[PDB]
Write a protein that binds this ligand. Structure first.
Ligand SMILES: CC(=O)N[C@H]1[C@@H](OP(=O)(O)OP(=O)(O)OC[C@H]2O[C@@H](n3ccc(=O)[nH]c3=O)[C@H](O)[C@@H]2O)O[C@H](CO)[C@@H](O)[C@@H]1O
Ligand SMILES: CC(=O)N[C@H]1[C@@H](OP(=O)(O)OP(=O)(O)OC[C@H]2O[C@@H](n3ccc(=O)[nH]c3=O)[C@H](O)[C@@H]2O)O[C@H](CO)[C@@H](O)[C@@H]1O
Lengths: 350, 350
């Protein structure tokens, strides 16, 4: 049994993919990757012991479907190239995780009669996934609403976060300033870098903060905190030991990218989500479940202010937090990785 | 508003299409037809006062499923024209009846985001419809079992048959010899042309027969009736007024072609179905619904014998016959043309 994972461009699509792959390789599967050379998967996949065939999707990047409907020809090359790869690798099934490289590969798998399985990581169906679903054999999504009748299996979660102790054990008799973790996605978010320091001035000693500013802002965010009179807080450009940071925290203030959301849930951590501002409210839809489950609270730009932030924090006792942490863990889907690996296997057995 | 109807070259595909097209044109809709120039529709549709655009689908007819998986480019030009024409006409929705053309035009309408509506005439789907049914917005079938669970709508039935009185009105009160109508599709069936004469020799004066022999076999069958010593029976090559014959019959012995079945059901007639012997067993499936309701009885060629027919006929009393007629009608879908037309309209509005 052979499999070809189709994902690239961002870690949002690549990491959940590598996770499902390694999982099936341990089951004896032969996995091969379909990506693009000028992008992230080019260097990452190899370091995972998975071969990767490349194709070029030049004038295919940033296409709004009306551009594809308007001009099909553009996808014809990649389609051709993909059919070639699968002509040679004879995959039993293909797994699309989203991203531009997923369009050609999906169409190709489908034209050859090879079953195509799809995983959507966000609350709002992305680029190719929206139109690629049409020719899919099975669709799965992380949270509800991306697609009408699609199974909710959640996002595969990084191992180090899955090994975190449950809330109870973690918050067992904790005392002192609420440990506040601030995270702005892998890049960092200006909004948090400029808001949290002022929130520190208002809460003062009621909290101890660990602030992740993103590359090139550590010095900036640090100085802001000092000028607010709270020099003791810790600022980091990028936290490598994300899991330990999660385990240390009482609560988290952060953007709501899909994986971060899933991780917080699996980690059982109270959250105050500050969704990225966009007409699609993707980030907003990624956090809804944890909120609707009563484990967090969302604040879009409309209601985002220094006070609303400090206000929301001052009201969560360690009692509430402990309650929110369990609601988060209960609302999580830790075994997402196998849930997808199994559906793929399931379709494999025609 | 504007609709593109796609029907191959064959009565089963065009007549149902024509019916629906006429129904919509009477409701304002503008209709365009897509077919071939070397097939039946390249003469009939124009006569029904409808515009028809042709497309070369030569290197497409004959080749099967795996034949297309191997040579995807074969349907390229067809798609070229199919799509091209739909840009110059701009359909709001397309209806595929089943013919070859059905494919190219469907792929085109699909690649243009134009909704696709499909209708299957037989209990078992043809080539094009089988696959074309994956990129369809709505799927309909005359009989159950041609597709997973498409909405059963039946087949459009010729007006002159619909205009018939109900079974009760014309069957109760009849006395004397049972009227047997022997029909063998629009071409006549050799097997019935040989069996019936013997059946008559065995049934004698208990029945009066009207036998439709198909073109070029009138004298042959007549002579055969002469042998049995039953010269009185009527033998016709092709009954022009099928309605009068149906209304006359007390029972029918015939083939199970899709349209003929819908006619028998709407007319409310008891039947002895002798499916066209074939590997796909298409005609067998077309007849099953009537048997399941006990409105008819089936006998495939393999089990077909002079005596099975005679005994079967001998066992049907004048009273039970009127019950079968009642359930035949009760199991018919008189308003197919309207259901399909409505679905087409329903979809179009979006
Ligand atoms: C452009 C934008 O608005 N953001 C998008 C971006 O989020 P973004 O990529 O910025 O955040 P994601 O959820 O994607 O990824 C975060 C990942 O980085 C890790 N991490 C983060 C910070 C840190 O200091 N250390 C660390 O290890 C987290 O554990 C997690 O694994 O991609 C997501 C899809 O995946 C989308 O849902 C977001 O909408
Ligand atoms: C050419 C050929 O070999 N088969 C054709 C034949 O199959 P076939 O004969 O099997 O078609 P069907 O049984 O589905 O339809 C029969 C139709 O012919 C009418 N009828 C039949 C006998 C008669 O004497 N008078 C009469 O008017 C019936 O009322 C009915 O409307 O018709 C189909 C529908 O047109 C075509 O798709 C097929 O290509």
């Amino acid at each position: 049994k052979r499999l070809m994972v189709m994902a690239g461009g961002t870690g949002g699509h690549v990491f959940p993919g590598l996770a499902v792959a390694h999982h099936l390789m341990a089951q004896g599967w032969q996995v091969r990757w379909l990506g693009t050379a000028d992008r992230m998967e080019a260097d990452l996949v190899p370091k995972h012991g998975i071969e990767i065939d490349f194709i070029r999707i030049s004038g295919l990047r940033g296409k709004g479907i009306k551009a594809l409907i308007a001009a099909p020809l553009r996808i014809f090359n990649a389609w051709r190239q993909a059919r070639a790869i699968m002509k040679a690798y004879k995959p039993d099934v293909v797994l699309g995780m989203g991203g531009y490289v997923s369009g050609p590969g999906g169409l190709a798998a489908w034209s050859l009669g090879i079953p195509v399985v799809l995983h959507e990581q966000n609350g709002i169906a992305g680029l190719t996934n929206k139109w690629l679903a049409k020719i899919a054999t099975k669709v799965m999504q992380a949270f509800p609403g991306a697609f009408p009748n699609a199974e909710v299996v959640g996002n595969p979660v990084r191992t180090d976060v899955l090994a975190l102790p449950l809330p109870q054990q973690r918050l067992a008799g904790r005392e002192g300033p609420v440990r506040v973790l601030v995270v702005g996605g892998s890049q960092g978010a200006r909004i948090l870098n400029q808001t949290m320091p002022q929130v520190a001035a208002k809460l003062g000693d009621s909290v101890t903060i660990w602030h992740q500013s993103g590359k090139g802002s550590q010095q900036s965010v640090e100085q802001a905190y000092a000028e607010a009179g709270q020099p003791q807080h810790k600022v980091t450009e990028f936290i490598d030991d994300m899991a330990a940071a999660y385990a240390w925290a009482d609560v988290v203030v952060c953007r709501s990218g899909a994986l971060t959301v899933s991780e917080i849930a699996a980690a059982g951590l109270p959250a105050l989500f500050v969704p990225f501002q966009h007409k699609d409210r993707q980030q907003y839809w990624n956090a809804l479940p944890l909120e609707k489950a009563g484990a967090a609270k969302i604040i879009e730009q409309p209601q985002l202010s220094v006070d609303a932030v400090a206000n929301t924090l001052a009201g969560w006792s360690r009692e509430t937090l402990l309650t929110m942490a369990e609601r988060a863990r209960a609302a999580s889907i830790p075994d997402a990785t196998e849930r997808v690996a199994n559906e793929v296997s399931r379709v494999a057995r025609a």
